[PDB]
Design an enzyme around this catalytic site. Structure first.
Site, short mmCIF file in Angstrom:
data_model
loop_
_atom_site.label_atom_id
_atom_site.label_comp_id
_atom_site.label_asym_id
_atom_site.label_seq_id
_atom_site.Cartn_x
_atom_site.Cartn_y
_atom_site.Cartn_z
N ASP A 178 -7.50 -9.58 3.98
CA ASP A 178 -8.72 -9.02 3.41
C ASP A 178 -9.95 -9.79 3.86
OD1 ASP A 178 -7.25 -7.10 2.17
OD2 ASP A 178 -7.25 -8.08 0.20
N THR A 216 -6.43 4.10 2.29
CA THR A 216 -5.53 5.04 1.63
C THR A 216 -5.90 5.16 0.15
OG1 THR A 216 -3.65 4.75 3.13
CG2 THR A 216 -3.20 5.47 0.92
N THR A 217 -5.82 4.04 -0.57
CA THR A 217 -6.22 4.00 -1.97
C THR A 217 -7.55 4.71 -2.20
OG1 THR A 217 -5.01 1.95 -2.40
CG2 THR A 217 -6.86 2.47 -3.86
N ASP A 245 0.85 -1.18 0.00
CA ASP A 245 0.00 0.00 0.00
C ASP A 245 0.88 1.24 0.00
OD1 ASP A 245 1.02 -0.27 2.54
OD2 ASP A 245 -0.85 0.17 3.59
#
Lengths: 102, 285, 73, 512, 510, 517
Positions: free
Chosen positions: D379, D82-83, D49
């Site tokens: 995830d 963040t993305t 990330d």
């Protein structure tokens, strides 16, 4: 701290009697004058150590050439002990002080 | 310090030490072939072949050179005293050389044993200077003129002198600075101050006990150390002595007058001791 | 670290070992023509050898073969 | 003592905003590059990330640092995003930069954003799909799918459902965190891929095999767990001490003694409580005897995280002092067993008095496969725990994005003017996410997104890209499942920094 | 100059250009900074830390220019900010705007005094007609609305939307405790910002709110004799010897225990002097803490000077390092001196209530410092705009519905009063349009569009610009009643103030 | 902050992907050329595999950095194939470049590489034999025990280490349940004899402390008595003053030694052996006087070694002399002082049939240079059988398998197609490079070589033939006796495919300004 003046004492110690010798140095050159002008008139004893001994003239003479070895030996050796102790004294000064302060 | 230049000092410096003379010429002979050698190199001649051609042909030339030459009499002192003089006359230095030709040639004739007169090594020659006097007072001496003299009570001039040499330390061993004492207090050292006493005297006593009339003493720096209270007693033993002489001049002294290197009382007998008929220092002139 | 492949190594492997291989054959046999030994970092001091084992020591070499072949020498 | 103002400065702010955004771009999908980060460290740092490198990143635009903070925010807040927050700002900043020349510069900027991000959170909550325990599922069957979801993301075996229902368990056990920490997976190099165990208590990958470790019990049903933060070794009391000899027993004495103080300190906590002695740090070959000479188990050179796991699960207090003697700086599992698992000499701590740390054992010793599953499990955990935490869920791959984009540019038509130019570009913000994925999923950001627009003008339920399947469809029944809150929270930060930083072309600085 | 002598950087062109132009530079953002402000300003203060606001004075003080032009007028802007909490966002723009008419009149060739004096008498004429445009007066501090109604105007003149919950929260801080008659105090009412909770969780605890961890027990008494001390613990353990802890193995024994009994005597001497709360900007120590637990004297572990300062300020305390037995000089003040959890942060709480002297301490719970300090900024300059010390503030249109009235008033009259001064008198009525523009700036339309319509609103006092589109298309928002007026006084100064420096900074060619 | 283009980075990637891959390509096998390492010290060193040279070579680009990381694993498990992955990495990667230079996603084809891996892996899973057994493998061992000792230190293949190395494995192979570790077996480098002088030990060999040979050299039983403590009066391997009061008291001093010889002898013996490793080194005197009195003890010993022998015995050390125990002494099925080297004292051979978890091959060498190169040599054949004992499966490869596995994948490309089609095509050609790239290192046209077996692969698939890695006129695999544990090649397949994937990792090409800074 303790390590400071341990060395400067025996520094100051052998410093002074060494300098006492300097008076005796002149005397050790003068005793080469005094005894050499003694032909056996006055009884010459060495005063060498605590026994005071019936002595002869060469015993008187060879002794003071050997008594100069006092001024020779004791003076010289200390100039070692001077700096021999001095440096280790100087060394230990800043080390232990900065600690106890820090 | 270019390498080619580095060689050329020894070019003369050999000729410096070879004949003592003609050292210009040996440089003046250099560039002459150095020209010609590049020529051959420019001719493409192989430097070996160039080399190979030379000491070969050098052997030739010296003969024809020697063919030109006139031998003189090397056995005759005067012939050479005429010739080298004439060579001195062929040279600049005359004034003293005139005076000094007999002194040279005689000092030479004195180092001339052979009728061949060998090479006459300047080896056997000791050239000494004395500050006083004049060139007239330059003189040939048949036993070594030695630097100074050093004696406390030591006899000023001893005849028939047994020449001692001290390659041994007269100073008591150094356990602290120079002294057999160790440095802590006044009391413990004085008893081993007594030790520094006797040792320096005994070795000194031992000196005269195997005995010498004269004692060569190198420098005390040419020594580890030499106790003077020993020497104070050593000349008090009434030995004529010199102190502080070149260990290299010693090597000259050892070979020329036969006073051999002595590090030991035992090396004193008469053995390594040159026997010097008259030992005296001259303060005069 | 400098990865030196055949391209770099060979030329470097030659230049010392070849041209130093010159210096040893330069002084070789009775007619072997001497080399002035270049005392490097110390004086000039001029030394003259028919022996390459001398040459090995005098001027230090980084050429790996020339380094290795000092031992071979 | 500095400053700056104006569109010449303003676009410059936006200028940096677009740059970094391409780092978080596909960083989700593991196809792209990655930049190994060496710093004054001199060491390799490689990310999944941007937030990792964002922490690394130091900005000449502190405006770029602004979005960082808010991109860090929902990221660290959710453990991800963040993305999300990154691309959201930079999007409009990209979008508005041509407007900027016309100007959106009047502070009418945010009035768009607010209402823009407003309609959606409403539209999102109605498109947020809530779930319960026995509701559609078992609540394990829920997270079964939610873990199946992210386990079906990138390819592994039927281990997906194998891992899914399992990892759901300690989730259902310790779920308080959205984080996987309390459940954190133990990679085991060895064993079979069919070998995996979600462990309800702290399980130590490794302790070292000592002298006497073979003599130390590998079994305690009452481990009293010493958590040691220091070394107990032969040098505690050093074993080399010189001795004066008028006789030979002087050596015997000086040796047989300095050995004891080693035993002495360590036996104090031993005699007190300690059967399980855990040092995160080396144990000397002589002291591990004294450990084993008692036959109370010691473990030196053990994971700090496990050491900290233990303090969490086992109720133990981390000890920096063996000279500290007590049973509550110990800890009580009712299981200490050590069975070497694969090659790792492997401590089992369960029966913790509470056990607030679980760990999932993953075996098979396949480094490529497993670490990818481990990213897959994160995830799954990221989903399943937050799929709990927000039981209202929603489909990924931009499932509502073309719809929102539609739904949003649906509202565009009425404005037209500066804020419609947003509402469309605000609608356009949504396709960038599948757009990058069209690279990854093997698609046409040109062709596909419109198809999904079409399939949100034809469909419009969830229809959107699957990077997983490499197709496009309803992502909820493509099973791509994430909560809507993170997407709500994505919105909240989306326009926020966007409307925020665009309010500054007037910038002041005072390095002096 | 031509000669190597003559120290100066100001003059002639560079006066009629650069000075005024440098004055133009800073008023640029003050436009975006006054009235409803959607604009925002990043600032790093020599922390490199970004901060965001609309206010000039916070920023300008930092900014450093060669020329006293900028360096002077801020003082007047301060002189405003000193007397009036807000409008300082405006106080700069008008002068800088009104100035640049001169350099134009200088291209038009009007003399210094000629340009100056027209503004002057018109400023007096303003100061004459400016109170004529007083459209209201304030009334009751006890009323939250009567206060909060205004307070928005300045919060507005900082930030637009937040003002609503805020202005109420402000009079809910009880601006009312003080009469606002010859008296009012910030430090008593002082903002105390709790990072965490919500920003709208920003609360009111009358009586001190100290975010500092509230230690010991609660105060020995609530009247507490309060001995506040800068660093009453420098440590009673000494840092000396070898390890920066100990040297000799015998050292550690005396280091550890010496801190105790000293602090014991220290904290006993806290009870011996009778301090019922101990405040240590110096360190906290558990023994001393337990001593403060024994002697039951509430402990403060660490202090900003602001803590010590206010404690020195409010309590009448004096913060001093005591390695020294504490001696009450500080004594007590506050009749109720508490521990509390506000924002559920341990909050050191002293409270005493007096018509003057009462601490009614604004406690900001907030999610973001960078906000809550700018949230502080507007409420600061809002309650400082509440500071007039006229309970009836002789209100005039807030957010500037005034200028259109006066822009009509003067330049019309401006021609009536004749002579080239009239043009300076007529130029005087022009730069009024600044905030109508400066809002139309952040609103996004033309001040001409604004003023043409807001001249077309003619005698109004009400309709004017603002935020949204009602400052855009009509340029009409009711700046008498949006609920928004402003005091004549803060208005009265800006004209008066921005009259002076502007006039001044022109006069100086050196 | 300086962000570059992934393309630009992909350049720096591929720019790094070459020389390292190249490094092997003329270095592959004995037909490959030696790899020289010159140090920061300027130290000329001939190197091998990847990991030897790769760690020695100072890695610069992320690839170079990532190389050694990936590269270690292949020599860890397999011992061989380390040189291949680096070749294999760039080979496919540098076409993946060309493919991306076609405007191809790294995204899309790399899956195909991951996916064509398996189908080549499975094609590999066809190749050669699935089985080796204890006596069987020995000849395939001998095959590799040829080429492993027919490679580095000598090409002679002394069957000594060839069948000594396998035995240590074969000894610890079954021990671990068909597993082994290379602590669990050990190469003991110590010189004093040449390469032709080697050994296999069931335990430790240490050169037995003797302060005098005439004071009897005694080794006995099977057992060592393991002591951190004295078997004869201690000393911390340092200076110690030995004084006595009078002239006679020097004699009573040795009695104390003499009694505490037997006092310790009689103490330590009853608990097993007489042979007691004493971490304490002692002065000459008591050592030989105990050697005299009875039953030599080992003095001046590594604290590790008293530990090494203990953990080798699986029992402990006796830490304290006041203490003692049999477990804390040695479990050894043999302890014998045996003449060590030609140059020095007898080694004390502890070969443990009581308990040994470690069985160690010992090697003398005529140089360190050779004994280390053999020490460098062995681990490979040591590790391949480590694969064998777990999975005894080997694959004939190096020109049989590459073009083989490539051919199916070449065909799989056309079966599969799209992104995998140019994946599996390019996936394949990289394999076929290695045998090609051997004729690169060898004297033969690399093209026509690959062509050659390419004809043979059309002829026969997964042949017992292959190229000539030994450059024999016959191009074989069986009779080249070239082969690899099908573990290894597959494991070797994984790595470059792993790494050429790892270059793709996620997204981020941005740095703080620091990526390689």
């Amino acid at each position: 701290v303790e390590k400071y003046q341990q060395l400067q004492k025996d520094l100051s110690k052998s410093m002074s009697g060494r300098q006492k010798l300097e008076a005796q140095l002149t005397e050790n050159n003068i005793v080469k004058e005094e005894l050499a002008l003694l032909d056996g008139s006055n009884v010459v004893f060495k005063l060498l150590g605590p026994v005071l001994v019936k002595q002869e003239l060469g015993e008187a003479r060879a002794t003071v050439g050997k008594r100069l070895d006092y001024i020779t030996a004791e003076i010289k050796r200390y100039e070692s002990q001077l700096r021999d102790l001095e440096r280790q004294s100087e060394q230990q000064r800043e080390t232990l002080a900065q600690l106890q302060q820090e | 310090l270019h390498p080619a230049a580095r060689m050329l000092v020894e070019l003369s410096k050999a000729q410096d030490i070879e004949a003592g003379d003609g050292t210009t010429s040996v440089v003046i002979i250099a560039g002459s072939l150095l020209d010609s050698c590049t020529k051959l190199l420019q001719k493409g001649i192989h430097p070996t072949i160039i080399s190979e051609s030379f000491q070969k042909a050098l052997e030739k030339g010296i003969e024809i050179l020697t063919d030109m030459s006139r031998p003189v009499e090397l056995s005759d002192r005067e012939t050479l005293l005429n010739s080298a003089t004439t060579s001195l006359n062929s040279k600049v230095v005359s004034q003293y050389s005139s005076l000094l030709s007999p002194m040279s040639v005689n000092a030479v004739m004195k180092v001339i044993d052979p009728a061949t007169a060998t090479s006459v090594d300047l080896r056997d020659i000791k050239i000494v200077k004395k500050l006083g006097g004049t060139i007239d007072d330059c003189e040939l001496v048949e036993g070594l003129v030695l630097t100074q003299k050093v004696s406390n009570s030591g006899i000023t001039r001893v005849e028939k002198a047994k020449i001692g040499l001290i390659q041994f330390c007269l100073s008591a061993p150094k356990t602290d600075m120079d002294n057999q004492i160790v440095v802590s207090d006044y009391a413990q050292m004085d008893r081993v101050l007594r030790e520094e006493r006797a040792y320096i005297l005994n070795l000194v006593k031992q000196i005269k006990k195997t005995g010498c009339n004269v004692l060569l003493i190198q420098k005390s720096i040419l020594r580890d150390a030499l106790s003077d209270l020993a020497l104070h007693f050593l000349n008090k033993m009434k030995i004529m002595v010199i102190k502080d002489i070149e260990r290299e001049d010693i090597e000259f002294i050892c070979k020329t007058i036969g006073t051999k290197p002595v590090a030991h009382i035992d090396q004193f007998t008469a053995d390594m001791l040159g026997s010097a008929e008259l030992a005296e220092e001259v303060n005069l002139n | 670290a400098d990865e030196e492949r055949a391209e770099t190594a060979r030329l470097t492997s030659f230049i010392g070992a070849i041209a130093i291989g010159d210096l040893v054959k330069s002084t070789l046999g009775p007619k072997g023509m001497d080399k002035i030994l270049l005392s490097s970092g110390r004086d000039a001091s001029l030394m003259v050898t028919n022996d390459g084992a001398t040459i090995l020591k005098n001027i230090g070499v980084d050429n790996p073969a020339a380094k290795v072949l000092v031992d071979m020498s | 003592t500095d400053s700056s103002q104006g569109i010449p400065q303003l676009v410059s702010n936006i200028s940096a905003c677009q740059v970094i955004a391409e780092a978080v771009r596909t960083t989700l999908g593991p196809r792209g590059m990655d930049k190994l980060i060496v710093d004054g460290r001199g060491k390799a740092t490689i990310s999944n990330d941007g937030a990792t490198i964002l922490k690394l990143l130091d900005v000449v635009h502190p405006a770029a640092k602004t979005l960082v903070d808010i991109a860090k925010s929902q990221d660290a807040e959710v453990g991800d995003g963040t993305t999300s927050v990154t691309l959201l700002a930079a999007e409009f900043l990209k979008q508005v930069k041509p407007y900027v020349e016309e100007g959106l510069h009047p502070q009418i900027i945010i009035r768009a954003f607010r209402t823009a991000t407003q309609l959606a959170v409403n539209k999102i909550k109605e498109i947020a799909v809530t779930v319960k325990k026995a509701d559609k599922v078992e609540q394990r069957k829920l997270l079964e799918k939610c873990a199946m979801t992210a386990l079906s993301s990138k390819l592994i075996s039927q281990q997906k459902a194998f891992f899914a229902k399992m990892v759901v368990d300690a989730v259902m056990m310790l779920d308080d965190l959205l984080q996987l920490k309390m459940i954190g997976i133990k990679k085991v190099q060895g064993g079979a891929l069919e070998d995996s165990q979600l462990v309800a208590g702290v399980a130590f990958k490794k302790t070292f095999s000592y002298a006497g470790f073979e003599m130390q019990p590998k079994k305690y049903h009452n481990p009293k767990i010493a958590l040691l933060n220091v070394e107990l070794e032969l040098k505690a009391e050093k074993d080399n001490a010189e001795i004066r000899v008028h006789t030979v027993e002087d050596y015997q004495a000086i040796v047989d003694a300095e050995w004891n103080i080693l035993y002495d300190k360590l036996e104090k906590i031993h005699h007190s409580g300690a059967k399980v002695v855990l040092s995160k740090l080396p144990i000397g070959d002589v002291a591990t005897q004294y450990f084993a000479d008692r036959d109370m188990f010691c473990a030196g050179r053990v994971p700090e995280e496990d050491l900290k796991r233990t303090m969490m699960a086992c109720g133990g207090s981390i000890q920096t002092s063996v000279n500290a003697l007590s049973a509550d700086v110990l800890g009580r599992c009712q299981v200490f067993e050590e069975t070497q698992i694969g090659g790792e000499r492997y401590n089992f701590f369960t029966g913790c008095p509470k056990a607030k740390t679980c760990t999932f054992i993953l075996r098979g010793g396949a480094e490529q496969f497993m670490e990818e599953t481990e990213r897959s499990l994160h995830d799954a955990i990221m989903i399943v725990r937050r799929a709990i935490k927000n039981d209202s869920v929603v489909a990924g791959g931009g499932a509502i994005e073309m719809e929102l984009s539609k739904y949003l540019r649906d509202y565009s038509r009425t404005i037209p003017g500066k804020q419609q130019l947003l509402i469309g570009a605000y609608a356009k913000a949504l396709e960038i996410i599948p757009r990058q994925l069209c690279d990854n999923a093997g698609f046409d950001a040109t062709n596909i997104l419109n198809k999904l627009r079409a399939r949100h003008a034809q469909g419009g339920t969830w229809y959107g890209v699957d990077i997983n399947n490499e197709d496009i469809a309803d992502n909820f029944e493509a099973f791509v499942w994430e909560p809507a809150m993170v997407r709500i929270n994505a919105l909240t930060a989306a326009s926020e920094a966007a409307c925020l930083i665009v309010s500054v072309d007037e910038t002041i600085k005072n390095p002096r | 100059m031509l000669k190597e002598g003559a120290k100066h950087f100001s003059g002639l062109e560079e006066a009629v250009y650069r000075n005024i132009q440098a004055c133009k530079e800073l008023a640029q953002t003050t436009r975006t900074a006054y009235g409803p402000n959607g604009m925002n300003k990043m600032v790093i203060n020599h922390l490199e830390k970004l901060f965001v606001t609309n206010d000039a004075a916070t920023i300008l003080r930092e900014l450093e220019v060669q020329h006293p032009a900028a360096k002077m007028i801020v003082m007047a802007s301060h002189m405003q900010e000193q007397e009036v909490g807000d409008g300082t966002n405006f106080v700069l723009v008008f002068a800088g705007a009104l100035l640049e008419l001169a350099e134009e009149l200088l291209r038009i060739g009007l003399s210094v005094s000629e340009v100056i004096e027209g503004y002057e008498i018109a400023c007096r004429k303003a100061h004459e007609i400016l109170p004529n445009l007083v459209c209201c007066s304030a009334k009751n501090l006890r009323d939250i609305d009567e206060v909060s109604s205004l307070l928005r105007t300045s919060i507005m003149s900082k930030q637009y939307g937040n003002e609503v919950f805020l202005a109420k929260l402000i009079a809910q801080a009880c601006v009312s405790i003080f009469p606002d008659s010859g008296h009012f105090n910030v430090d008593n009412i002082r903002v105390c910002k709790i990072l965490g909770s919500g920003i709208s969780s920003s609360s009111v605890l009358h009586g001190m709110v100290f975010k500092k961890e509230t230690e010991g027990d609660v105060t020995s008494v609530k009247d507490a004799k309060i001995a506040v001390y800068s660093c009453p613990f420098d440590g009673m353990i000494t840092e000396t010897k070898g390890t920066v802890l100990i040297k000799t193995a015998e050292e550690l024994m005396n280091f550890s225990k010496g801190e105790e009994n000293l602090m014991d005597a220290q904290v006993k001497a806290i009870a011996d002097t009778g301090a019922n709360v101990v405040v240590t900007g110096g360190k906290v120590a558990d023994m001393a803490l337990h001593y403060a637990n024994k002697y039951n004297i509430m402990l403060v572990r660490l202090n900003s000077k602001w803590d010590l300062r206010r404690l020195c300020k409010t309590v009448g305390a004096t913060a001093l390092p005591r390695l020294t037995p504490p001696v009450l000089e500080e004594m007590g003040h506050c009749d109720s001196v508490y521990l509390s959890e506000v924002g559920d942060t341990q909050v050191v709480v002293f409270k005493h209530e007096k018509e003057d002297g009462a601490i009614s301490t604004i406690v900001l719970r907030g999610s973001t410092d960078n906000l809550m300090d700018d949230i502080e900024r507007a409420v600061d300059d809002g309650v400082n705009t509440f500071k007039v010390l006229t309970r009836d503030k002789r209100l005039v249109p807030g957010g500037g519905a005034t200028e259109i009235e006066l822009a009509k008033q003067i330049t019309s009259y401006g021609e009536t009063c004749p002579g080239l001064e009239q043009y300076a008198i007529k130029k005087f009525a022009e730069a009024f349009e600044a905030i109508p523009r400066a809002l139309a700036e952040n609103s996004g339309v033309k001040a001409n569009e604004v003023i043409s319509k807001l001249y077309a609103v003619h005698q109004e006092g009400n309709k004017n610009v603002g935020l949204d589109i009602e400052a855009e298309v009509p340029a009409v928002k009711d700046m008498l009643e949006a609920g928004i007026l402003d005091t004549y006084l803060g208005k009265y100064w800006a004209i008066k103030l921005a009259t002076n420096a502007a006039v001044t900074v022109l006069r100086v060619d050196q | 902050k300086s962000r570059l283009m992934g393309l630009e980075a992909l350049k720096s990637h591929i720019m790094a992907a070459k020389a390292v891959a190249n490094t092997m390509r003329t270095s592959l096998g004995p037909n490959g050329l030696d790899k020289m390492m010159v140090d920061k010290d300027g130290d000329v060193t001939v190197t091998n595999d990847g990991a030897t040279i790769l760690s020695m070579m100072d890695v610069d680009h992320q690839i170079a950095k990532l190389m050694v990381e990936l590269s270690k694993s292949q020599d860890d498990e397999i011992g061989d194939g380390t040189t291949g992955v680096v070749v294999l990495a760039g080979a496919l990667l540098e076409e993946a470049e060309q493919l991306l230079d076609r405007g191809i996603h790294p995204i899309r084809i790399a899956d195909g590489y991951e996916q064509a891996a398996r189908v080549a892996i499975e094609h590999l899973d066809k190749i050669s034999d699935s089985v080796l057994v204890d006596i069987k493998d020995t000849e395939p061992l001998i095959q590799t025990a040829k080429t492993t000792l027919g490679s580095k230190v000598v090409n002679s293949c002394h069957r000594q280490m060839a069948e000594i190395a396998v035995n240590a494995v074969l000894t610890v192979a079954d021990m671990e349940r068909r597993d082994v570790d290379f602590e669990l077996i050990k190469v003991e480098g110590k010189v004093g004899g040449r390469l032709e002088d080697t050994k296999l030990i069931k335990g430790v060999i240490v050169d037995k402390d003797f302060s005098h040979p005439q004071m009897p050299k005694k080794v006995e039983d099977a057992k060592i008595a393991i002591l951190t403590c004295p078997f004869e009066p201690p000393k911390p391997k340092t200076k110690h003053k030995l004084d006595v009061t009078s002239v006679e008291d020097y004699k009573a001093l040795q009695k104390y030694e003499k009694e505490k010889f037997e006092e310790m002898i009689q103490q330590i013996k009853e608990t097993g052996a007489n042979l007691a490793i004493c971490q304490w080194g002692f002065d000459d005197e008591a050592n030989h006087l105990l050697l005299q009195n009875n039953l030599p003890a080992v003095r001046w010993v590594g604290g590790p070694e008293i530990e090494l022998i203990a953990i080798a015995t699986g029992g402990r050390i006796v830490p304290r002399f006041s203490e003692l125990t049999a477990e804390k002494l040695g479990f050894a099925g043999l302890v014998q002082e045996i003449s060590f080297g030609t140059t020095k004292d007898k080694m004390l051979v502890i070969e443990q049939c009581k308990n040994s978890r470690a069985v160690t091959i010992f090697i003398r060498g005529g140089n360190k240079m050779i004994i280390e190169e053999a020490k460098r040599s062995l681990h490979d054949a040591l590790c391949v059988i480590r694969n064998l004992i777990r999975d005894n499966r080997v694959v004939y490869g190096g020109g049989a398998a590459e073009i083989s596995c490539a051919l199916a994948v070449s065909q799989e490309a056309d079966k599969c197609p799209t992104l995998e089609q140019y994946a599996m095509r390019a996936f394949a050609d990289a394999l076929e490079v290695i045998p090609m790239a051997l004729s690169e290192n060898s004297g033969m046209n690399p093209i026509q070589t690959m062509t050659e077996v390419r004809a043979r692969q059309v002829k026969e698939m997964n042949p017992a033939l292959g190229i000539d890695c030994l450059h024999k006129g016959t191009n074989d695999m069986k009779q080249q006796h070239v082969i690899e544990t099908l573990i290894g090649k597959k494991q070797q397949i994984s790595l470059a495919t792993q790494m050429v994937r790892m270059i793709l990792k996620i997204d981020d090409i941005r740095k703080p300004g620091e990526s390689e800074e």
